[PDB]
């Protein structure tokens, strides 16, 4: 149908905007701490601690399959990155501190993303 096409064009354009958001958030991680999945070879107990692991490569795979329907879904995954790290790692660690800085800096990007998503529809 023509409606299915219009809906698909909307999803494609959301995917475009989320790709730019993802790039901007990942620039706030210049140490690449959050770039890839926590290795279960190197942290064999990880899944005993963290039930829903997340990282920027995993988000990018979902995004490119157009697997984010709305901004809320994308934000859920970004918050997982931060929240997983802040539980597994202690406050005095470079990991925890990276997550705090990513959260604080990402907030700004996500605030305007939400306005754009609502604005463009």
């Amino acid at each position: 149908s023509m409606e299915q096409v219009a809906m698909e064009l909307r999803l494609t354009e959301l995917t475009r905007l989320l790709r730019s958001v993802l790039d901007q958030l990942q620039d706030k991680d210049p140490a690449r701490i959050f770039a890839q999945p926590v290795s279960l070879k190197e942290v064999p107990d990880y899944l005993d601690h963290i039930k829903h692991p997340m990282d920027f490569a995993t988000m990018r795979k979902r995004l490119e399959a157009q697997g984010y329907k709305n901004l809320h879904e994308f934000e859920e995954d970004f918050d997982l990155i931060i929240d997983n790290c802040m539980k597994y790692n202690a406050r005095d660690t470079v990991f925890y501190r990276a997550a705090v800085r990513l959260r604080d800096q990402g907030g700004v990007v996500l605030r305007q993303a939400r306005r754009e998503v609502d604005s463009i529809g």
Side-chain angles (χ1 to χ4, degrees), residues 1-2 4-6 8 11-15 17-40 42-60 62-68 70-110 112-119 121:
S1 75
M2 200 42 239
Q4 287 297 312
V5 170
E8 296 163 354
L11 175 63
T12 300
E13 286 306 300
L14 177 62
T15 305
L17 176 159
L18 297 182
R19 191 176 305 110
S20 170
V21 175
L22 181 66
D23 290 344
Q24 285 176 70
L25 295 171
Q26 186 153 27
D27 290 336
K28 309 313 181 161
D29 172 35
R32 301 193 69 85
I33 292 165
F34 303 104
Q36 292 294 330
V38 173
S39 174
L40 306 173
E42 302 168 359
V43 188
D45 73 358
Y46 190 65
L47 299 184
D48 295 342
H49 290 269
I50 297 301
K51 296 296 167 185
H52 295 103
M54 191 48 52
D55 66 275
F56 288 127
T58 301
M59 292 189 62
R60 196 171 294 278
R62 181 165 169 192
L63 177 61
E64 293 311 334
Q66 301 189 344
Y68 295 114
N70 55 55
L71 183 54
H72 183 72
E73 289 188 346
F74 177 95
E75 292 173 321
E76 282 196 334
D77 271 356
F78 176 66
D79 284 337
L80 280 177
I81 293 177
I82 298 315
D83 289 341
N84 288 345
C85 185
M86 292 172 74
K87 293 168 184 72
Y88 190 81
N89 305 106
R91 226 160 17 253
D92 74 328
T93 62
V94 62
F95 308 105
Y96 186 114
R97 288 165 173 280
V100 166
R101 289 167 61 83
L102 176 64
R103 193 198 56 190
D104 286 351
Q105 296 194 284
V108 182
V109 174
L110 289 169
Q112 204 49 42
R114 161 53 61 205
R115 291 189 68 82
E116 285 176 1
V117 168
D118 293 356
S119 192

mmCIF file of all heavy atoms in Angstrom, residues 35-57, unseen atoms left out:
data_model
loop_
_atom_site.group_PDB
_atom_site.id
_atom_site.type_symbol
_atom_site.label_atom_id
_atom_site.label_comp_id
_atom_site.label_asym_id
_atom_site.label_seq_id
_atom_site.Cartn_x
_atom_site.Cartn_y
_atom_site.Cartn_z
ATOM 1 N N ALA A 35 32.459 1.083 23.015
ATOM 2 C CA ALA A 35 32.378 0.782 21.619
ATOM 3 C C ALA A 35 31.980 -0.608 21.255
ATOM 4 O O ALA A 35 31.310 -0.843 20.257
ATOM 5 C CB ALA A 35 33.747 1.105 20.973
ATOM 6 N N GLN A 36 32.335 -1.598 22.087
ATOM 7 C CA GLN A 36 32.102 -2.993 21.771
ATOM 8 C C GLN A 36 31.488 -3.751 23.007
ATOM 9 O O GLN A 36 31.644 -3.324 24.136
ATOM 10 C CB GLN A 36 33.471 -3.643 21.491
ATOM 11 C CG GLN A 36 34.119 -3.136 20.213
ATOM 12 C CD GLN A 36 33.360 -3.520 18.954
ATOM 13 O OE1 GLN A 36 32.691 -4.529 18.853
ATOM 14 N NE2 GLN A 36 33.493 -2.680 17.948
ATOM 15 N N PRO A 37 30.879 -4.906 22.769
ATOM 16 C CA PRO A 37 30.439 -5.705 23.903
ATOM 17 C C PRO A 37 31.466 -6.063 24.878
ATOM 18 O O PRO A 37 32.624 -6.296 24.481
ATOM 19 C CB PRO A 37 29.822 -6.953 23.253
ATOM 20 C CG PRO A 37 29.870 -6.780 21.847
ATOM 21 C CD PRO A 37 30.495 -5.524 21.492
ATOM 22 N N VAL A 38 31.161 -6.000 26.150
ATOM 23 C CA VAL A 38 32.051 -6.594 27.180
ATOM 24 C C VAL A 38 32.365 -8.040 26.777
ATOM 25 O O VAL A 38 31.479 -8.849 26.473
ATOM 26 C CB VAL A 38 31.466 -6.494 28.588
ATOM 27 C CG1 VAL A 38 32.332 -7.273 29.550
ATOM 28 C CG2 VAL A 38 31.313 -5.047 28.984
ATOM 29 N N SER A 39 33.664 -8.353 26.648
ATOM 30 C CA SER A 39 34.118 -9.709 26.273
ATOM 31 C C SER A 39 33.875 -10.808 27.383
ATOM 32 O O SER A 39 34.376 -10.645 28.475
ATOM 33 C CB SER A 39 35.633 -9.669 26.052
ATOM 34 O OG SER A 39 36.129 -11.007 25.828
ATOM 35 N N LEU A 40 33.148 -11.873 27.064
ATOM 36 C CA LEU A 40 32.868 -12.909 28.020
ATOM 37 C C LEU A 40 34.055 -13.813 28.117
ATOM 38 O O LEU A 40 34.248 -14.486 29.135
ATOM 39 C CB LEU A 40 31.581 -13.661 27.634
ATOM 40 C CG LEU A 40 30.382 -12.753 27.428
ATOM 41 C CD1 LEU A 40 29.161 -13.469 26.897
ATOM 42 C CD2 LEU A 40 30.084 -12.019 28.762
ATOM 43 N N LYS A 41 34.964 -13.779 27.125
ATOM 44 C CA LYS A 41 36.276 -14.430 27.361
ATOM 45 C C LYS A 41 37.034 -13.753 28.461
ATOM 46 O O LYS A 41 37.531 -14.419 29.350
ATOM 47 C CB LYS A 41 37.144 -14.486 26.083
ATOM 48 C CG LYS A 41 36.571 -15.366 25.023
ATOM 49 N N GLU A 42 37.118 -12.413 28.448
ATOM 50 C CA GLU A 42 37.840 -11.610 29.452
ATOM 51 C C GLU A 42 37.139 -11.288 30.820
ATOM 52 O O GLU A 42 37.805 -10.957 31.844
ATOM 53 C CB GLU A 42 38.298 -10.330 28.819
ATOM 54 C CG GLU A 42 39.202 -10.600 27.597
ATOM 55 C CD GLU A 42 39.480 -9.379 26.740
ATOM 56 O OE1 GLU A 42 38.940 -8.303 27.088
ATOM 57 O OE2 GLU A 42 40.197 -9.551 25.706
ATOM 58 N N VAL A 43 35.795 -11.270 30.774
ATOM 59 C CA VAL A 43 34.968 -11.096 31.952
ATOM 60 C C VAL A 43 33.951 -12.239 31.987
ATOM 61 O O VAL A 43 32.739 -12.100 31.700
ATOM 62 C CB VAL A 43 34.258 -9.740 31.982
ATOM 63 C CG1 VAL A 43 33.572 -9.574 33.357
ATOM 64 C CG2 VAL A 43 35.250 -8.596 31.679
ATOM 65 N N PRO A 44 34.426 -13.472 32.314
ATOM 66 C CA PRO A 44 33.567 -14.642 32.223
ATOM 67 C C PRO A 44 32.305 -14.673 33.093
ATOM 68 O O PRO A 44 31.361 -15.265 32.650
ATOM 69 C CB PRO A 44 34.512 -15.827 32.602
ATOM 70 C CG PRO A 44 35.666 -15.202 33.214
ATOM 71 C CD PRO A 44 35.783 -13.771 32.821
ATOM 72 N N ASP A 45 32.296 -13.952 34.203
ATOM 73 C CA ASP A 45 31.127 -13.867 35.095
ATOM 74 C C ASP A 45 30.159 -12.737 34.690
ATOM 75 O O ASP A 45 29.208 -12.529 35.443
ATOM 76 C CB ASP A 45 31.543 -13.683 36.588
ATOM 77 C CG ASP A 45 32.089 -12.280 36.971
ATOM 78 O OD1 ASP A 45 32.236 -11.349 36.182
ATOM 79 O OD2 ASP A 45 32.408 -12.063 38.184
ATOM 80 N N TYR A 46 30.384 -12.043 33.563
ATOM 81 C CA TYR A 46 29.633 -10.778 33.342
ATOM 82 C C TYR A 46 28.096 -10.970 33.391
ATOM 83 O O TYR A 46 27.370 -10.107 33.941
ATOM 84 C CB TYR A 46 30.059 -10.105 32.011
ATOM 85 C CG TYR A 46 29.526 -8.685 31.822
ATOM 86 C CD1 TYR A 46 29.929 -7.694 32.650
ATOM 87 C CD2 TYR A 46 28.726 -8.376 30.794
ATOM 88 C CE1 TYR A 46 29.502 -6.396 32.469
ATOM 89 C CE2 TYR A 46 28.242 -7.063 30.591
ATOM 90 C CZ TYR A 46 28.661 -6.100 31.400
ATOM 91 O OH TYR A 46 28.252 -4.793 31.290
ATOM 92 N N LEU A 47 27.610 -12.050 32.800
ATOM 93 C CA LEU A 47 26.171 -12.221 32.636
ATOM 94 C C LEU A 47 25.534 -12.635 33.963
ATOM 95 O O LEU A 47 24.303 -12.531 34.080
ATOM 96 C CB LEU A 47 25.815 -13.210 31.515
ATOM 97 C CG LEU A 47 26.273 -12.837 30.126
ATOM 98 C CD1 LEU A 47 25.695 -13.922 29.194
ATOM 99 C CD2 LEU A 47 25.867 -11.453 29.665
ATOM 100 N N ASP A 48 26.355 -13.016 34.969
ATOM 101 C CA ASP A 48 25.830 -13.222 36.301
ATOM 102 C C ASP A 48 25.439 -11.864 36.942
ATOM 103 O O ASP A 48 24.619 -11.782 37.866
ATOM 104 C CB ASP A 48 26.794 -13.911 37.247
ATOM 105 C CG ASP A 48 27.151 -15.345 36.868
ATOM 106 O OD1 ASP A 48 26.456 -15.979 36.081
ATOM 107 O OD2 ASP A 48 28.177 -15.808 37.448
ATOM 108 N N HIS A 49 26.097 -10.779 36.485
ATOM 109 C CA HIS A 49 25.918 -9.438 37.052
ATOM 110 C C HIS A 49 24.923 -8.658 36.196
ATOM 111 O O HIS A 49 24.013 -7.962 36.738
ATOM 112 C CB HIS A 49 27.289 -8.736 37.047
ATOM 113 C CG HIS A 49 28.238 -9.297 38.025
ATOM 114 N ND1 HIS A 49 28.379 -8.841 39.307
ATOM 115 C CD2 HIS A 49 29.100 -10.332 37.902
ATOM 116 C CE1 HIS A 49 29.282 -9.572 39.940
ATOM 117 N NE2 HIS A 49 29.739 -10.474 39.095
ATOM 118 N N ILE A 50 25.118 -8.663 34.920
ATOM 119 C CA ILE A 50 24.410 -7.780 33.954
ATOM 120 C C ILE A 50 23.533 -8.666 33.031
ATOM 121 O O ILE A 50 24.021 -9.502 32.253
ATOM 122 C CB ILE A 50 25.433 -6.938 33.119
ATOM 123 C CG1 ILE A 50 26.216 -6.023 34.063
ATOM 124 C CG2 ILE A 50 24.722 -6.203 32.003
ATOM 125 C CD1 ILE A 50 25.399 -5.045 34.888
ATOM 126 N N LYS A 51 22.230 -8.449 33.171
ATOM 127 C CA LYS A 51 21.310 -9.297 32.425
ATOM 128 C C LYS A 51 21.038 -8.897 31.001
ATOM 129 O O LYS A 51 20.594 -9.753 30.180
ATOM 130 C CB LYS A 51 19.978 -9.385 33.147
ATOM 131 C CG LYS A 51 20.186 -10.072 34.500
ATOM 132 C CD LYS A 51 20.646 -11.506 34.398
ATOM 133 C CE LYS A 51 21.149 -12.085 35.725
ATOM 134 N NZ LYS A 51 21.723 -13.462 35.646
ATOM 135 N N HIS A 52 21.224 -7.588 30.657
ATOM 136 C CA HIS A 52 20.995 -7.096 29.343
ATOM 137 C C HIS A 52 22.238 -6.202 28.937
ATOM 138 O O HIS A 52 22.130 -4.973 28.977
ATOM 139 C CB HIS A 52 19.695 -6.322 29.346
ATOM 140 C CG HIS A 52 18.499 -7.191 29.634
ATOM 141 N ND1 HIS A 52 17.875 -7.223 30.868
ATOM 142 C CD2 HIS A 52 17.889 -8.148 28.873
ATOM 143 C CE1 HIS A 52 16.890 -8.121 30.833
ATOM 144 N NE2 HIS A 52 16.886 -8.697 29.644
ATOM 145 N N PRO A 53 23.291 -6.869 28.514
ATOM 146 C CA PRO A 53 24.472 -6.123 28.050
ATOM 147 C C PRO A 53 24.147 -5.244 26.843
ATOM 148 O O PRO A 53 23.254 -5.581 26.019
ATOM 149 C CB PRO A 53 25.413 -7.201 27.611
ATOM 150 C CG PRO A 53 25.094 -8.405 28.314
ATOM 151 C CD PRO A 53 23.569 -8.329 28.377
ATOM 152 N N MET A 54 24.877 -4.118 26.721
ATOM 153 C CA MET A 54 24.658 -3.238 25.562
ATOM 154 C C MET A 54 25.982 -2.499 25.301
ATOM 155 O O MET A 54 26.812 -2.318 26.221
ATOM 156 C CB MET A 54 23.471 -2.254 25.796
ATOM 157 C CG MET A 54 23.063 -1.531 24.526
ATOM 158 S SD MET A 54 22.807 -2.450 23.006
ATOM 159 C CE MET A 54 21.667 -3.744 23.532
ATOM 160 N N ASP A 55 26.107 -2.046 24.082
ATOM 161 C CA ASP A 55 27.312 -1.295 23.633
ATOM 162 C C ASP A 55 27.014 -0.589 22.284
ATOM 163 O O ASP A 55 25.987 -0.897 21.674
ATOM 164 C CB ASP A 55 28.473 -2.265 23.459
ATOM 165 C CG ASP A 55 28.212 -3.223 22.355
ATOM 166 O OD1 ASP A 55 27.558 -4.255 22.574
ATOM 167 O OD2 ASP A 55 28.548 -2.877 21.173
ATOM 168 N N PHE A 56 27.888 0.310 21.858
ATOM 169 C CA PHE A 56 27.553 1.068 20.703
ATOM 170 C C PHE A 56 27.547 0.243 19.387
ATOM 171 O O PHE A 56 26.758 0.526 18.445
ATOM 172 C CB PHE A 56 28.480 2.278 20.484
ATOM 173 C CG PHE A 56 28.312 3.408 21.429
ATOM 174 C CD1 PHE A 56 29.409 3.940 22.133
ATOM 175 C CD2 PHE A 56 27.081 4.037 21.546
ATOM 176 C CE1 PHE A 56 29.263 5.033 22.908
ATOM 177 C CE2 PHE A 56 26.923 5.161 22.354
ATOM 178 C CZ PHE A 56 28.043 5.647 23.061
ATOM 179 N N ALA A 57 28.394 -0.787 19.274
ATOM 180 C CA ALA A 57 28.355 -1.628 18.066
ATOM 181 C C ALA A 57 27.045 -2.397 17.918
ATOM 182 O O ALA A 57 26.450 -2.484 16.819
ATOM 183 C CB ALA A 57 29.579 -2.546 18.034
#
